Every structure is written in structure tokens, then in C-alpha cells.
Symmetry: C2
Subunit: 409 residues, 2 copies
């Protein structure tokens, strides 16, 4: 196969002159992935592949691995240019980069480690060869993550399954509370996992059902060996996800409470809901104003965190959301100004989660509300349901508990 058409199509949406892919052994996994180099290909020497906007790619390779490079590129219609000495390497590099505004796997300030792969010394060498500009390839790399129509349809089937499963899970808890019968996190988790598997889907890791203080630990997963029994007066948080094999996940988080919650929990909910709405509103309003192309992931985190307010933001020690793909935590832009300042631009055809929360462990509780957003070319759209209130579990009939949680009363 040839990787060059896809790389040039990605470049066409930029104003850059080309993409300079550099690798040495395991340094830059993106190099081998974008170029379609098989894992079984043994490459011990450094190489560059220059891909201009239009025209032939240029492969700068050490002459000792010319045979492997002929095989790699036999369908590429590229120039293959061997080098031996550092003088030959530098002359070839000057030939390709001088006066060029180019991208490399580089992240300013090392903000995004998964993209920041080219070593400092090699970047110095590229600049010394006369490159006019070195920009991050992070946005180019996102072009490869665009969903197909079948990907979107599969995501929506997973979303619908999750909406059903979260209702059945919360109804189970509701029924147990009303009946005074014990229920554990693991039992609820397994109800959900059984539904995912029966639908031909898979979760990867077992889903998160958290009661009480466990909901304050984002890194909680109940198991058969260790899981909590629910008691009245404790919160519930369920973060569940599923995909059809090889298709994008859906991934949502819904909350409830065992009985009537107090004012503090309710206030925290309003703050988390306000955070979610602020992120969604900034995404919508920026798209209306200017389309996609300037809005960056970190800005939605800022919107959510600001809107959450001074009482509950100190207990929101997490990013606002993540790229959502065939990997649940996808390789594209995340909604993060917390762990990283993610300056990647939100890209049409990708999807992100919006999942602010607040986690006061000191009883202690955790709230998170997670929806998925597909960055459709005609505008961002939420693909999973919006919770308006925590489910108040064990009081009344389930249909009405659900309706209140949906704001349908």
C-alpha cells in the first residue's frame, strides 16, 4: 500500500508545505504507523520521510537499509535517497527542508507526550538545515481518526445499548432499595456486562459501579472479590462503555442517590451540570461563530471548570473529557487544561466526551455526568442522553424516578 495520498490529503487542510516524519528505532511510533511500516520490519538506522503537499515523497535512508526501504516503499512512487555520512545526511536534509514550513511529531513544551516524539537534537538539526517553521503534526494526525458513516452508526448502536443498560442498572438498585434487599456494586456491574455481551458488544475493562465514597475515586472498579453493599443515604455513580468490535465506543456516566439526597449533594449536582452545559455551549457557540478549526480542547475544560464554581471545582481534579474512538481514550484531542494543556484543535468527524465531576471523599460522594459529542461537519451534536437530575432511587415507581432524572416531569 501507499501512505502518501492520505498524508497529502491531511496536509491539504493545512497551510503547511509538508510533513517531515523522523524515526530512530522505537523513538517515534507514529512514524511507522502513519507510513504503514509493518512491525516485522527491522530498521536499525534513523530515517526521514518528507511528504510535500503535492508531488513525490522523499525518503532519506541509510544505505545499509536500502533493501528494506525498497520493499517498504515499492507501492509509494517516492524518491529514495540513500545517505552514508553525516555530511550526506545534512545535504539531503537541507535539500528537503530549506525554506519549508513543515510538521513533525513535536509538541511545544512537551504538552502532549504521545505526539512529542522527535528528540531535541534532531529538531535542532532540522532547524539548522534551514526549515522555515517546525509545527506540531498533532492536528494532521487527527485527520486519520475521522469516523466513517459505519463507525458513527456503530457508535450510536452502542449509545442506545448504554442508555438501556443504565436504566436497567438503576432500576435494579431502585427495586432492591424499595424491597430492603441487599445490592452490591458487582451485581450491578454484571447486569451491565451481561447486557453488553448479549448485544454482541464488548467493554474492554469491566464497567464502573461505585457506591458512596467509592464514587470519589475515579480509579474504582468493583470486582467479585471486593465490592460494596449499598446503604440508604449513599450516592451511586455508574460509568459504562461499550463498542462493537473495531468500532468507536460509546461511554457515559449517570448518577443517583439511595433515597433523598441532602442539600450538599444537590448543590454539587447543579455545579456539575452547569460545568457540562458550559462546555457544550462553548462548543456550540464557537462552531456557529466560526466553524471548527480554531477551538482547542483545553478551552472546553476551562469553560467547564470555570462554570463549576469555587465550591466544587477544588474537588474536580481531572480533565473535562477525552477523545472517543475505537480506543475508549482515543488518540485525538482531549478536553484538558488540567493534566495537560491540550492545544489540539477539535476536528470535524471525531468525537469527544464531556464528563466533568466533583469528588469530595470526606458521607463522601462523587458526581460525574458524561455525554458523548460527535463533531459532525454541520455542527457538534450530543449522541447520548442528558441527565437533568440524579436518580432519586428507592422512592416511588421507577418510571417516575427515571422521568425526574431526565427532566421529563
Amino acid at each position: 500500500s501507499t501512505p502518501i495520498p492520505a498524508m497529502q490529503a491531511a496536509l491539504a487542510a493545512t497551510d503547511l508545505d509538508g510533513w517531515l516524519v523522523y524515526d530512530f528505532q522505537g523513538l517515534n511510533p507514529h512514524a511507522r504507523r502513519v507510513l504503514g511500516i509493518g512491525d516485522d520490519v527491522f530498521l536499525t538506522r534513523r530515517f526521514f520521510v518528507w511528504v510535500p503537499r503535492a508531488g513525490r515523497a522523499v525518503v532519506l535512508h541509510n544505505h545499509i537499509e536500502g533493501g528494506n526501504w525498497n520493499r517498504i516503499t515499492q507501492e509509494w512512487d517516492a524518491e529514495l535517497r540513500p545517505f552514508g555520512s553525516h555530511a550526506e545526511l545534512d545535504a539531503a536534509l537541507r535539500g528537503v527542508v530549506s525554506g519549508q514550513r513543515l510538521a513533525m511529531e513535536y509538541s511545544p513544551n512537551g504538552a502532549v507526550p504521545y505526539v512529542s516524539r522527535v528528540d531535541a537534537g534532531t529538531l535542532e538539526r532540522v532547524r539548522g538545515a534551514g526549515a522555515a517553521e517546525v509545527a506540531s503534526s498533532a492536528d494532521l494526525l487527527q485527520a486519520f481518526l475521522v469516523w466513517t458513516p459505519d463507525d458513527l452508526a456503530a457508535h450510536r448502536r452502542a449509545a442506545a445499548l448504554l442508555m438501556r443498560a443504565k436504566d436497567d442498572a438503576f432500576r435494579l438498585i431502585h427495586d432492591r432499595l424499595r424491597a430492603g434487599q441487599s445490592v452490591t456494586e458487582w451485581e450491578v456491574q454484571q447486569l451491565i456486562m451481561d447486557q453488553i455481551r448479549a448485544a454482541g458488544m464488548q467493554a474492554g475493562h469491566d464497567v464502573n459501579v461505585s457506591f458512596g465514597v467509592n464514587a470519589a475515586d475515579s480509579h474504582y472498579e468493583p470486582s467479585e472479590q471486593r465490592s460494596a453493599t449499598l446503604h440508604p443515604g449513599e450516592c451511586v455513580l455508574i460509568d459504562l462503555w461499550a463498542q462493537e468490535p473495531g468500532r468507536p465506543f460509546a461511554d457515559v456516566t449517570w448518577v443517583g442517590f439511595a433515597g433523598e439526597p441532602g442539600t450538599e449533594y444537590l448543590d454539587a449536582w447543579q455545579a456539575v451540570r452547569a460545568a457540562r452545559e458550559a462546555a457544550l455551549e462553548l462548543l456550540r457557540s464557537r462552531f456557529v461563530a466560526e466553524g471548527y478549526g480554531r477551538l482547542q480542547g483545553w478551552e472546553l475544560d476551562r469553560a467547564a471548570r470555570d462554570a463549576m464554581g469555587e465550591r466544587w471545582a477544588p474537588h474536580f481534579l481531572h480533565r473535562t473529557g477525552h477523545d472517543l474512538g475505537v480506543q475508549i481514550h482515543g488518540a485525538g484531542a482531549n478536553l484538558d487544561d488540567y493534566e495537560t494543556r491540550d492545544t489540539r484543535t477539535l476536528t470535524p468527524g471525531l468525537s469527544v466526551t464531556v464528563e466533568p465531576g466533583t469528588y469530595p471523599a470526606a458521607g463522601g460522594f462523587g458526581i460525574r455526568s458524561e455525554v458523548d459529542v460527535y463533531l459532525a461537519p454541520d455542527g457538534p451534536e450530543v449522541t447520548t442522553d442528558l441527565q437533568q437530575a440524579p436518580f432519586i432511587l428507592g422512592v416511588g415507581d421507577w418510571d417516575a424516578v427515571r422521568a425526574a432524572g431526565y427532566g421529563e416531569q
Copy 2:
């Protein structure tokens, strides 16, 4: 175990304030090797380990992997400092690097890819945190390559075996030529390999016996399936190496000719010998003048290449030599201003090969003369024999052929 004493001992021989080890997943293999982190340890997040000249190491790690970091460091007597947000990371980094002259796995201009592992963006971040100087850790890394007395003794046993084996190999060729009996490269190779194995040693890759034009290909290895039969009027080159398991290799190259060589071959020999002597003489004279500590690997390549002269240097399209270790091509300084400009300093207790050659394939021939040099604290010393003339094979008695090759007539 704890890696910190060895790192501080290495730092003591420098004027730097400390060594800042950075890694993210597979980016910097040196990080995990120097720190003694087992391959079975799953670390998904970036980390820094600050090792000052004296005092506690400081580990900056993501809080999500604190458990793994407790286990890694349980014998280190280090400070463990978690971070979550980028603001926390940057405050911690400023605390450790501000005003410090430090080393990282960084190679200016990307001259030495095996050392140049920290990404450009992370280096920007370290400088932005106030580091006073970022220097390459390349020389620090060489401190870990110093031979023990048992390593040196094992190297010398391998050297002695190679001196015997190369005599027996060339005597075999001599005898076959005198008798008019065919001899192949593979037959000679297998004589040598049998001797290596009988001595309890191992070669890794089968050794190089090259006849005629094959000696012009540095990347030639005969095999049972494909090997040449010697004819009168062709050169011979034998590059052979061996180690005791887990001990440093010896690695040498000796040349001969089937019958009396012409003036061109003899002139090439004088140039290669002059190149070898010039590298050895610069090493010796610099040590006498100033000891080790300033002389860099590339300078011996320049000496050899300059001395080879304008007729034969154009056919010397290779580095002058390599670090010699438990890996035949060791991780330390190489004698190279050809493929790379290796600015690493020649380090007492390591060994290098000096192996200039010239390879005019157009009959065509190749000459290389390789000796091993141990960088003893009291001065550099050659540990294998110095060839003074190519063996003139098939003429006279072997003892005299050998004596002429040794300059012993």
C-alpha cells in the same frame, strides 16, 4: 537495588549539579536501564528522576502510578513527589532544576541517536523551568561501561585466541595455494568458528572471510550456500571476533594476498597502516600531554582519514572504529567523524577498535587493519597484534610469511 550511588559516582567525575532522567513509555530506554527498572514494570505516564551530586534523588511521578513507584524505589532512599496537574508538574520541575547545570539524554544536533532520546518539547519545558544548562549525559553513560579486571583478562584471552586463529586461517590458505588445492571463504570461516567454539568462546555472528572483490564490501559474510573460491592474484581479508560469555569481545582484522601483490595494493596497504598509526599516535600523544578527558572519538577518525591521504581516503567510506564491549559494537564512544561526529570523550577503562581501511571495488580489493585499544588509566595500550605487512600467501614457508607480516624479518 538502588541505582543512585552509581549515578552519583558518575556525576562526581563531572562538574554538573545533577542528572535529570526523563522517560515516557518507550521514548528513552536509558532511563529504565540506568534506574534499574525491570522490563515487566508497566509505566504509562511520563516521569522525571533528579539525581543531584549528593543527597536524595527526587522522583517526580504521576500520582496514578504511585504504587509502582513505591515498589521501584523501595531500596533507593529517595524523595517521591507525586503530581497530577501540569501546574503541579511544572512547580515540581522548577523546584528541582532552577539554577541547576544538569545532564539529560540529549545529543546536540542529534549526532548520537542512541543517546538523543528526550523529546524537543520536554527539553523546552526543562529550560522553561529555569535549568541553567542542559548537557548531554553521553559521557556519564560511559561510566557504566568501565571494564572490571576480570573483563580485561577475558578480553585478553579472546585476543590471544584470535591471534592464534588468524594464523591458522592464513596458514590454511597459504598451504592450499602452495598445493594448488581449492579453498573457499566458508572453509576458512569454519576453521575459525571451530577454534572459537573449542575455546569456550562465542562470536555472535559468524566471522568474515573475504576474497577478492568481497573484501571491498564491509557487509560481507560468507555462508555455506554462497562463498568464493580463492584464485591467485586476489586479496584476502579476515575480520574475526570472539568473547567469553558475558565478557568483552576481542575483534581484529588482518589481510593477505594470494601471491605477490601489485604496487597498487601495496600502496593502499601503506596508506591504511599510516591511518592506523596516526590514530594510535594521537591517542598516545594526547594522553601524555593532558591525560584523558578532552580527546573525543571523532578526533581519532580525523587523524586516520587525514593520514590515509587523498588517493585512498575516497575509498574509506566508513568510520575509523567503535567502542568494544560485551556487545562487539559497544554503547560507548566511537571513533567516528564519518557517519556521525561523535563528540563523546574517550573514557578510561573502556576499549575502542582502530580499524581504518580502503575498499576500491573496481581486480578490486579491500584492506582493513584492526587492533583493539584498552584505555587503561595509566595510558592507552594496544591489546592485539600490529600487522606490518599483508601476508604474502602461498610463497615460501608459513613461518616466514607470518614473520614478514609481523615485520619480524
